[PDB]
Amino acid sequence: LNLDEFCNCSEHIPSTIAVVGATGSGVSTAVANLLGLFYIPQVSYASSSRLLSNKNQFKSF
Amino acid sequence: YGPDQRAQKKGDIILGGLFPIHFGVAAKDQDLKSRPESVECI
Amino acid sequence: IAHALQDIYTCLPGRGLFTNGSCADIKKVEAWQVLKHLRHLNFTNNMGEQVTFDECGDLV
Numbered sequence: 001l002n003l004d005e006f007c008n009c010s011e012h013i014p015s016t017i018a019v020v021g022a023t024g025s026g027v028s029t030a031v032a033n034l035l036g037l038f039y040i041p042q043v044s045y046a047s048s049s050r051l052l053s054n055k056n057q058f059k060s061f
Numbered sequence: 062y063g064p065d066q067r068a069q070k071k072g073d074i075i076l077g078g079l080f081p082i083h084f085g086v087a088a089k090d091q092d093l094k095s096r097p098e099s100v101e102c103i
Numbered sequence: 104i105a106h107a108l109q110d111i112y113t114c115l116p117g118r119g120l121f122t123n124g125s126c127a128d129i130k131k132v133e134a135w136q137v138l139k140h141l142r143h144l145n146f147t148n149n150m151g152e153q154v155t156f157d158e159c160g161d162l163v
């Protein structure tokens with residue numbers, strides 16, 4: 001919605017349904033911002049910071 | 062966004078801006094039964 | 104992720120997680136539906152343990 005104009009992307013670009021990552025908690029937070037912007041689930045394997053338990057910010061983590 | 066929710070002016074060099082016009086966002090919870098929609102700040 | 108997709112794929116017509124018990128279509132599945140199914144996930148590991156996530160998405 002942020003752009004009034006219309007953007008174009010080639011159909012060859014696929015749609016990611018979920019993401020596996022990442023290792024660092026700061027990296028996971030930065031990724032989680034954009035991913036939860038679009039409600040894309042993200043499942044981490046090494047990030048263990050408690051700050052990523054807050055669901056008022058990280059909707060899909 | 063929308064004409065009522067943005068301040069635009071054309072020029073040679075464009076500067077961005079980010080200001081809080083609302084103190085906080087909606088407290089409505091999400092159950093993901095339907096497609097999530099845009100949230101409205103209150 | 105695969106088990107959430109499978110739970111989508113085997114949805115009974117009147118037991119879906121969505122409005123009025125509606126189910127998703129696995130041919131045109133969307134990210135938020137997979138997130139919904141991950142929030143209510145419960146499956147068994149290869150070694151034989153149960154894997155669920157809490158209200159915050161944690162596995163202890």
Ligand SMILES: O=C(O)[C@@H]1Cc2c([nH]c3ccccc23)CN1
Nearest residue numbers: 023024025026045046047048049
């Ligand atoms: O949150 C974090 O950044 C750490 C990173 C991390 C953990 N365990 C590891 C093993 C190997 C390499 C990196 C890690 C625990 N979570």
Ligand SMILES: *[C@@H]1O[C@H](CO)[C@@H](O)[C@H](O)[C@H]1NC(C)=O
Nearest residue numbers: 144145146147152153154155
């Ligand atoms: C998950 O499924 C197992 C069956 O293997 C059951 O015993 C357990 O109570 C279930 N847990 C939840 C939270 O539904």
Ligand SMILES: [Ca+2]
Nearest residue numbers: 022023024027
């Ligand atoms: Ca990393």
